[PDB]
Amino acid sequence: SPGIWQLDCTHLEGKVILVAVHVASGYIEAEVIPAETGQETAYFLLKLAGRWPVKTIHTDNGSNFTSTTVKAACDWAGIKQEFGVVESMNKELKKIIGQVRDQAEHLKTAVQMAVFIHNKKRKGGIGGYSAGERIVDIIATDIQ
């Protein structure tokens, strides 16, 4: 279903990374954030929801997902929250990040290089599709 994303929080090099996975496509958005706050989650969601159609987000019960500040952003943006292939995309991202890490000074850049690669990479050879191509396809054919 074209509007469903899982959002999730993870750490590397003592920094915090917010990761959002589009479930049907495997397309990812992520960013290093300064602290694990609901405010940071809210800002991150507004950005995501302004770029893609976001209808439902799945998360866990961490306080950075259940606060007022997040709930206000979801109400404003028209996003439904649910609390409890995806654990899989998070591991793929960390592997990409590890591999490309030495091509960037800060982790924040490395993460965006990893996102670029994750979304442009092909599985199944020269003919295969990328997450980035799958998501615009899914969404494009929902508007028809």
Add this chain to the structure above:
Amino acid sequence: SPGIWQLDCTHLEGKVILVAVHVASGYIEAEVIPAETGQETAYFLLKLAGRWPVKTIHTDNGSNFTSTTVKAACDWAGIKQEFGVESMNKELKKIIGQVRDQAEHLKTAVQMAVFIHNKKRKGGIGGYSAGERIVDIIATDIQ
């Protein structure tokens, strides 16, 4: 042409805002950034290029576009630069002004404005949004 974006820098409330316009669709991405540096432009471009297919960017000759740090990001991401649609920038400022009271900081207000700009319809109930136009243009470039 589906891979072309104009990138441009602007100010409000003494803060700096980076704005990238997808020329065929009018789709916008923008963010408040802490200073008008090439480093901030580079980071912003990586993010953009990882999300959409970016082939060429048009900018002006400000030092925050011609530095090494930007040229390195373009080389890495495979982006061609051109030096030398003020319309979408004015629309955005109007939008920002109108929602501004619904948010405490400008940075949030700007993202609410971008959400609105990309979702809004011209030409009535049947009209298309910038957000719908861009995924269409890109979807039919693969096929």
Add this chain to the structure above:
Amino acid sequence: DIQMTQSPSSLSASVGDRVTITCRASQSVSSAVAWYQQKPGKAPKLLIYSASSLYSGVPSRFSGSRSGTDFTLTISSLQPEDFATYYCQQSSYSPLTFGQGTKVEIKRTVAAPSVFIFPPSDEQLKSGTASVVCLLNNFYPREAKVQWKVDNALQSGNSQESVTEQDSKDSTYSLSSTLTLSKADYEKHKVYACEVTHQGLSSPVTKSFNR
């Protein structure tokens, strides 16, 4: 400097009619066209924006459409409150510009004017000027032609007309025309005539007096 050519200027209709007003842009203006309604002595009120979006609260019988540079406002079933003037606007290029307007007025059967001519009062003549007045009363439609003749000589540039708004009971118009001369010139002549041409008259009617 973009031009919005609105047509027609004036339009006669009945309650229940389909009505359609057009506006032609002198070059592409994209979808950035709005429509406003204005009643006498009132501010313009917004109807339609961005070519075809209906302003909050405006009845669904109003709609808009576009083809290229041609914009149309359509009132599917005209209501008594819709008799008014309408204006298009483009805001694709500064300066933003308006069409010149379309008055929507009420149809009814033809009615010929009654016509009266009044010479100038003597109190006015003392003052040095003479006003001669011609009255066309309770006529439809609005188009009427009024020619002043002094000793059979058709006048020009020395008369002004005024027209009432459509009468709220019977939908007619009334018209006064006022020929203005010096006392000295008024006294140089004998026959003051008002000739009125109107579709309700089988032929022109003249009302006159001798000074």
Add this chain to the structure above:
Amino acid sequence: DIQMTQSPSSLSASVGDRVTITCRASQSVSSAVAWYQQKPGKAPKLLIYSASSLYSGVPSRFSGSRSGTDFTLTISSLQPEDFATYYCQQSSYSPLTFGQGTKVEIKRTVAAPSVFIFPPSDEQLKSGTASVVCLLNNFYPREAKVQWKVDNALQSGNSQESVTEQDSKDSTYSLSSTLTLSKADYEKHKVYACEVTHQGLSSPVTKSFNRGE
């Protein structure tokens, strides 16, 4: 615990042939299948990844393909260095699992084994065990069946076989089978027979001796 069923187990080919090997996944594993080549006593070397991408440095004659849960490795024109064993792998679900392998061996004309049986030496008999050995020499193809018979009674569970690798000169195989008995049991019987079945023999060949002479 996902299964990759690889087939065939063994395959005979000639230089120049088009060769194909398949791997069937027990449920969708998407495109996450790899192929490796392994020569005897060497480490596996990667050929193909993600179903159909060709690993850097691998000759273009190797290719991979997918249809649903069926994966194929194809060698368009087999070269002498391609005789080896090949394995598929999936890494769509932990644990990652391998097919059981496909040996690619060299075709040549049929050659029937020559067959010999050797009784146990007397020095071994002193020690309390008897080994009886049957040798199949220089045969092709590899499939051969070897049954031991003691006084016409087919044996079971008391023999082991060992096979040579394909001979580098003549492309044949050789095989030894070794029946093991106690001295005491060896002595309770007369006729030790080795029966060998192989395509090159119009019918089974038996070599035997009598523990007497």
Add this chain to the structure above:
Amino acid sequence: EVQLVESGGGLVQPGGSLRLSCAASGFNLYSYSMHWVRQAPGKGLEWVAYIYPYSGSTSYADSVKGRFTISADTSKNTAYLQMNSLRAEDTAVYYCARESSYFYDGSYSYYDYEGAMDYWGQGTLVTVSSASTKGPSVFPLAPSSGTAALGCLVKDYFPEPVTVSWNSGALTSGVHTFPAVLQSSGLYSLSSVVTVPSSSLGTQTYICNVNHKPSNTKVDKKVEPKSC
């Protein structure tokens, strides 16, 4: 509830100056683009200027460049149009109007206004003229010879408006009071007229009551048939 109330209009001589204000309430004027649009008497609508205080941009019609200055005071939620070097052709009703960027439908959708103006004030009149306040002369429009017409000619007054009634308001049926016309002298003139039965002449009296507040003038004029 949104509204706009303009003020500051009036009578002013050519070369003179005025300042219009537009006081807003129900919304924050800083946040929106505000326009002045004007309408000459009996003409259509002409855009004059705009300001978007948040961003500080402003803009003017060519026919007002150099003479007019738009501005805002946010502490008062008010916009202003300073009008200098006024000519006769700047005579008009001046409206302020709000331009919203978008409209939110109250269930997750947004529509672009593309420069349309959602709320307008009632307008303020600016009259630019050399003419001076002056009360009207009133002259009879006398009947003679089954319907007769008679009336009052209300001549040479400035500025608008004038009020005409018949028999102190008792007579209203058959009355037509015409829109004033601006004469080449700069002064206004109109007629009011009424049709009545012929039989009622010489038996009924008809008096028009003319009032022009700007000059504190009040005239009653009897209207009766002539002799010739």
Add this chain to the structure above:
Amino acid sequence: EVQLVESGGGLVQPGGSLRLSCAASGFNLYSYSMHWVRQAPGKGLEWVAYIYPYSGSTSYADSVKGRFTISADTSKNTAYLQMNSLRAEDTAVYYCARESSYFYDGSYSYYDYEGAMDYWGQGTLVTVSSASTKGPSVFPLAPSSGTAALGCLVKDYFPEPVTVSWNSGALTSGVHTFPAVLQSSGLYSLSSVVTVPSSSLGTQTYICNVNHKPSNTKVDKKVEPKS
């Protein structure tokens, strides 16, 4: 060119322990997922464990869970497999291998490896057995009466390997020396054979030379027709 060199394998008794290491060079091991994969003698390949040090995650095959521990020391660019409570069935060649995330084609395209392993080490052998070092007994496989066959049976030795030659290396044609077979006793056994002309029996001598270094055993056995 990167590489991996495993070490620490050898002989060990059931219940015992060993620690394998895998030393990397040409690349930073911290940055990649590293696997151990093993191969029992004459069997296929079985995945054992993995570690991705950068993120710290690890994983184990069910048949080793609880007994084995994978780890890495980044200062030495080395991974380790600690193997406790060893059984006979853990006997195998153990390989370490690297898993890259992606491949970059040098010209703006990227391909996902999806768990494929791009570089492998040569492997280290782990043998798990109660058996004790012991040299072989060598017995003749004697001919009688074309071509004749004869040979040496090289029986009951531990551990591998043994070497067999004929007439001190002079005779190599027609020689087949078979892979050793592990007997149910835990000791190995093999045969070496040679086919020769019938006429050359009794005019030529055939001696097999057997050497088993682990027990410093060296046996020469003459092989002649029976009498």
